[PDB]
Amino acid sequence: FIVEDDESLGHKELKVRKGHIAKLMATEYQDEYTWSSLLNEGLVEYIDAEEEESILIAMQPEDLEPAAKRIRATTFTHCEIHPSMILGVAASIIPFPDHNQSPRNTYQSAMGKQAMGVFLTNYNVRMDTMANILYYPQKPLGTTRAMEYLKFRELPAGQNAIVAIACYSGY
Amino acid sequence: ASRHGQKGTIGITYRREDMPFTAEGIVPDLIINPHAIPSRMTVAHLIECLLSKVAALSGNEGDASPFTDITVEGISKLLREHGYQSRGFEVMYNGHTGKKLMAQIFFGPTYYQRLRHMVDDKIHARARGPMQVLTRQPVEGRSRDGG
Amino acid sequence: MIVPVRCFSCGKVVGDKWESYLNLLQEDELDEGTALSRLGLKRYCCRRMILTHVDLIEKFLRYNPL
């Protein structure tokens, strides 16, 4: 996001406003703003890996813009569109990756690729050497907003079960 | 495996008649060792379980959203108002006798996925099979019935 | 794929209600909560399935094989 230091309304503000996002929602639900159409009029700007050494970033769109759960300058130029987007494909599946040890997240990221489920829909027609398809895939009850864009909810991996954490004496 | 690297395998299988059972008559799908929790130190798994329970109760599907304001306290309050123990602990009965279990057990729904390593593909034995041509030793490979 | 039959945990027959469950969310614009509650699923074991089921035969069948 590009942030204009100047503001007639006062202190500082990122240029985009509510009208633009309303137009975006309207365009989407029509089933004519595109991401490109956001680019042209100067609302978001691409940043290569080199520039960051000359830019200050605001994590939240409200972190310091104006004047128990958890722990939370005035010269920002760009604000992150959303922090949860620093992940990749596989890690996006992990629910609450913040709330566990990082190597455990790495273990899961590597392992999830070894899970069955569905891989396409034409498989009844598509020959192949190897193929796994399970009976009753279920979209997990827990989920993040991301994998909706990953079409994951459409093509789930496993199915949830009623687990119990106990030592029932044998195995 | 879970969604948190907590891999594992099946040891044995019981059926309902002797599996531990709750007051409402629900019986668990599978049970894991509590000791697997602290050493690996995966906490988010438990939050997933609790949130999944409350989501199933309300019917409204839950949220993960790595960096957001959702905390455990709201989950506990909502689950409690739905009419269960706030932290998810549950009275539990022993199928063999029906007696009360002295402790309580954390217990709810959780997502799993099946892995690629079925035992049948990995069992292999050999006794006086084919020999290798060059060196007269047993051949290589399970598929080729090697040693 | 076809909605499962005979809920895993408990065993109550599920699937007969599935098509009823769909129209409850179409012309009655209720929530899934009240939908199932009127549908009559006290235990959540019978209920997790209806929540998380993903139809795929809908996508499959709309091919044109032969």
Binding site: Y29 | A55, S58, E61, G74 | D31
Partner: peptide, 20 residues
């Protein structure tokens, strides 16, 4: 104190459709 524990896609779809 829900703090938005849940999100619905079809409900938001219908709400913004009637909003339009």
């Amino acid at each position: 104190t829900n703090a938005s524990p849940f999100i619905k896609r079809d409900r938001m779809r219908r709400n913004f459709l009637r909003m339009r």
